[PDB]
Design a protein around this ligand. Structure first.
Ligand SMILES: Cc1nn(C2CCNCC2)cc1Nc1ncc(Cl)c(-c2cnc3ccccn23)n1
Length: 300
């Protein structure tokens, strides 16, 4: 005959609704509206914590179940450089998922906000080597953690990183900016072709080594303040260019070292690319002191 129905099963992440409050709306995701707020007793030794609250009500039960199970993916991760899931409210409506708040948003958006506006007003200078490296190492650390946890990301990109209040960069909540930056995708399956390794453009397979490639592109993103890679090239022309050993250009005024890093990631042969761990090792001396205390890299 056959094999039989999708459910959500409450667990230890279940949090009491009356412990949650919402205020400022941050935007809207696929499943519904996303708010900022306060959660009580969801971080150890913190009476109260600022959080992000993703909501589904209107919505069908199939839908909210699927939003529940998808968000839950984040439950198996505990890393300073990966955006946390703090709780779930699945009992009653509306359906809630409580996440770590990243006040400064997705990295692509943060990066763009640093672009000088077209007025006559004084402006902060472009990010320094040092700050840029700090971001690279935080991102790399989250990726290393993910890798060691048997994960392949497949969509590593600035849009898929977030930025905390203290400027700490982290691997973003999975799948939260795809639709928003829709032009960053191409239906080769909607895929982020400008971030893709040559091997992945060929056979459609993703590895940690193709996550490194994309990391290279994320660094380029930082250096250009979130320009579209292969700017002038059509989607199709990108495939050929990249598969044929083509490479992104050293950005105007990009420090040598950051470009060197990018360069090591964009090596054609995946087996010649540094691992995430190796990447961090090459730049640890440049990292803010506190990285020893918080990073996966330096941990047991
Ligand atoms: C991603 C993000 N954007 N923003 C605002 C930045 C200033 N402009 C208005 C947007 C605040 C967050 N922080 C954040 N932190 C955690 C999560 Cl989980 C989310 C999140 C998840 N899905 C969505 C969808 C839209 C907006 C935010 N999020 N956002």
């Amino acid at each position: 005959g056959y094999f039989s129905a999708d459910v959500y099963v409450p667990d230890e992440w279940e949090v009491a609704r009356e412990k949650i409050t919402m205020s400022r709306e941050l935007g809207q995701g696929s499943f519904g509206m996303v708010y900022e707020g306060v959660a009580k007793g969801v971080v150890k030794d913190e009476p109260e914590t600022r959080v992000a609250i993703k909501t589904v009500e209107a919505a069908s039960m199939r839908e909210r179940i699927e939003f529940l199970n998808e968000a839950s993916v984040m439950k198996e991760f505990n890393c300073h450089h990966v955006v946390r899931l703090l709780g779930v409210v699945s009992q009653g409506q509306p359906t809630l998922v409580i996440m770590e708040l990243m006040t400064r948003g997705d990295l692509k958006s943060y990066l763009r906000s640093l672009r000088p506006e077209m007025e006559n007003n004084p402006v902060l200078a472009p990010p320094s080597l040092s700050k840029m490296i700090q971001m690279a190492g935080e991102i790399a650390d989250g990726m290393a953690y993910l890798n060691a946890n048997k994960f392949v990301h497949r969509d590593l990109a600035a849009r898929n990183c977030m930025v905390a209040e203290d400027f700490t960069v982290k691997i973003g909540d999975f799948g939260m900016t795809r639709d928003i930056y829709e032009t960053d995708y191409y239906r080769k399956g909607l895929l982020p072709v400008r971030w893709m390794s040559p091997e992945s453009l060929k056979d459609g397979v993703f590895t940690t080594y193709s996550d490194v490639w994309s990391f290279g592109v994320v660094l380029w993103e930082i250096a250009t303040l979130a320009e579209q890679p292969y700017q002038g090239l059509s989607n199709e022309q990108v495939l050929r260019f990249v598969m044929e050993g083509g490479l992104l250009d050293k950005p105007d005024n990009c420090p040598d070292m950051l470009f060197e890093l990018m360069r090591m990631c964009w090596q054609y042969n995946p087996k010649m690319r540094p691992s995430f761990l190796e990447i961090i090792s090459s730049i640890k001396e440049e990292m803010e002191p506190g990285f020893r205390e918080v990073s996966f890299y330096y941990s047991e």
